[PDB]
Amino acid sequence: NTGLLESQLSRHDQMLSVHDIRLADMDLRFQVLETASYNGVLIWKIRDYKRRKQEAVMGKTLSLYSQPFYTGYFGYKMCARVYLNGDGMGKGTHLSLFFVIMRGEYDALLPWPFKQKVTLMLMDQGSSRRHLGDAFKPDPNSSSFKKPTGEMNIASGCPVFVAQTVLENGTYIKDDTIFIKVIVDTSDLPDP
């Protein structure tokens, strides 16, 4: 019958669809890898600041995540979260920057809770290089630094990192893009 030809076409179309997602996913997966780091330092590049800022305001997209980064080849898996329009006490007024601990595939061998010092910062692209940053020492009793249970733990950082004005007036933005850098202390910890 022709119902056979059409069924076969349908089968193919269905699979071609799947293949497309599989492909798209891998493009994403490539990207993540190509930008991975294993020395506990993250350099997160955020293009389209205007549009993304606007989507934060419009409530379309409140926050953004960096690709994951590591303290070592088989160490903690972490990342960053930013709210272009602020969160909490900085909401609407500042840019909030947080640190996140993700469920690593080797947590069973890592020390908990997380105790490595974290240094959050936004880079200045102007030639005077007056970067903005602040560091902290994980709070042992905080549920953000315990052995992950779900994919990610509660983000912990600075809700009032930078005043949105300061950000948008200084030389931090250039070519509609900003750079965020995280520095996790690794030296102080028995390495593999």
Binding site: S63, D87, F98, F136, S142, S144, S156, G157, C158
Partner: peptide, 7 residues
Amino acid sequence: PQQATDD
């Protein structure tokens, strides 16, 4: 170290 709203 301050935490983010639940979301």
